[PDB]
Scaffold this active site. Structure first.
Site, short mmCIF file in Angstrom:
data_model
loop_
_atom_site.label_atom_id
_atom_site.label_comp_id
_atom_site.label_asym_id
_atom_site.label_seq_id
_atom_site.Cartn_x
_atom_site.Cartn_y
_atom_site.Cartn_z
N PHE A 1 -5.27 6.13 -0.92
CA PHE A 1 -4.56 5.06 -0.71
C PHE A 1 -4.63 4.21 -2.02
O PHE A 1 -5.68 3.87 -2.48
CB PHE A 1 -5.16 3.92 0.31
CG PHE A 1 -4.99 4.34 1.95
CD1 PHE A 1 -3.66 4.24 2.57
CD2 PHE A 1 -5.95 5.06 2.51
CE1 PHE A 1 -3.54 4.83 3.73
CE2 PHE A 1 -5.82 5.42 3.88
CZ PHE A 1 -4.58 5.45 4.50
N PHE B 1 2.46 9.76 2.92
CA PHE B 1 2.78 9.63 4.39
C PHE B 1 3.33 8.23 4.70
O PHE B 1 3.88 8.13 5.70
CB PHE B 1 1.66 10.22 5.10
CG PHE B 1 0.27 9.43 5.00
CD1 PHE B 1 0.27 8.29 5.68
CD2 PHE B 1 -0.63 9.73 4.02
CE1 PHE B 1 -1.08 7.47 5.56
CE2 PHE B 1 -1.70 9.13 3.93
CZ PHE B 1 -2.01 8.02 4.47
N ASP B 2 2.91 7.32 4.13
CA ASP B 2 3.18 5.83 4.36
C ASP B 2 3.33 5.05 3.18
O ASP B 2 2.38 5.09 2.26
CB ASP B 2 2.20 5.28 5.58
CG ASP B 2 2.67 4.02 6.39
OD1 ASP B 2 4.19 3.82 6.22
OD2 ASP B 2 1.96 3.32 6.72
N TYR C 1 -8.69 8.60 10.61
CA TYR C 1 -8.03 8.95 11.72
C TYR C 1 -8.98 10.04 12.50
O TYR C 1 -8.63 10.78 13.73
CB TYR C 1 -6.62 9.29 11.45
CG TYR C 1 -5.65 8.40 11.26
CD1 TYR C 1 -5.09 7.35 12.15
CD2 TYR C 1 -5.57 8.23 9.87
CE1 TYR C 1 -4.25 6.58 11.46
CE2 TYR C 1 -4.63 7.01 9.47
CZ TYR C 1 -3.91 6.46 10.17
OH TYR C 1 -3.21 5.18 9.85
N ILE D 1 -7.00 1.01 9.60
CA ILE D 1 -8.09 1.89 9.71
C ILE D 1 -9.24 1.16 9.25
O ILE D 1 -9.48 0.28 8.44
CB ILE D 1 -8.07 2.97 9.25
CG1 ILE D 1 -7.47 2.88 7.87
CG2 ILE D 1 -6.88 3.90 9.81
CD1 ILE D 1 -7.54 4.23 6.72
N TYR E 1 0.61 -1.27 -0.10
CA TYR E 1 -0.16 -0.22 -0.06
C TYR E 1 0.74 1.40 0.09
O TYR E 1 2.28 1.08 0.56
CB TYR E 1 -0.83 0.23 1.34
CG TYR E 1 -0.12 0.23 2.56
CD1 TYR E 1 0.03 1.48 2.96
CD2 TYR E 1 0.22 -0.85 3.16
CE1 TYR E 1 0.83 1.93 4.17
CE2 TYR E 1 0.97 -0.53 4.61
CZ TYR E 1 1.32 0.73 4.94
OH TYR E 1 2.17 0.80 6.18
#
Length: 128
Positions: free
Chosen positions: A118, A55-56, A101, A75, A45
């Site tokens: 995502f 961010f990730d 979040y 999440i 991902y």
């Protein structure tokens, strides 16, 4: 403008039909089966903020990310979204804060009340 297709054409995959999680299939997967609650799932991902900043990513760890579906190890948007995927599928998810979040965000990279993008590839999954 990578977020555009999902933001404009994405399918609302929520139960409440609140547009909280929107989905586009980018690459069709193989077979009939979708992973079920309790199954072990293996994903790659990448996540980006509404401002486009990544961010990730599982690739920054150089390994797939592994979790048990439906156990709140990820999440809400992923527990819902991954359960809609076939093996080998790549999808985009657009996730409102209620499925991510929320008002708090997540320090230090995710702001309060963030809508997130995502890309998720479902590599494999195995019975619960």
């Amino acid at each position: 403008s990578p977020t555009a297709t999902v933001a404009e054409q994405g399918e609302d995959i929520t139960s409440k039909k609140d547009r909280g999680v929107l989905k586009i299939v980018k690459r069709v997967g193989n077979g009939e089966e979708t992973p079920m609650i309790g199954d072990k799932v293996y994903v790659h991902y990448k996540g980006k903020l509404s401002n486009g900043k990544k961010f990730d990513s599982s690739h920054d760890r150089n390994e797939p990310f592994v979790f048990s579906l439906g156990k709140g190890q990820v999440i809400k948007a992923w527990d819902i979204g991954v359960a809609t995927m076939k093996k080998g599928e790549i999808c985009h998810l657009l996730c409102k804060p209620e499925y991510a979040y929320g008002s708090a965000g997540s320090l230090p990279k995710i702001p309060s009340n963030a809508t997130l993008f995502f890309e998720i590839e479902l590599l494999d999954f195995k019975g619960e």
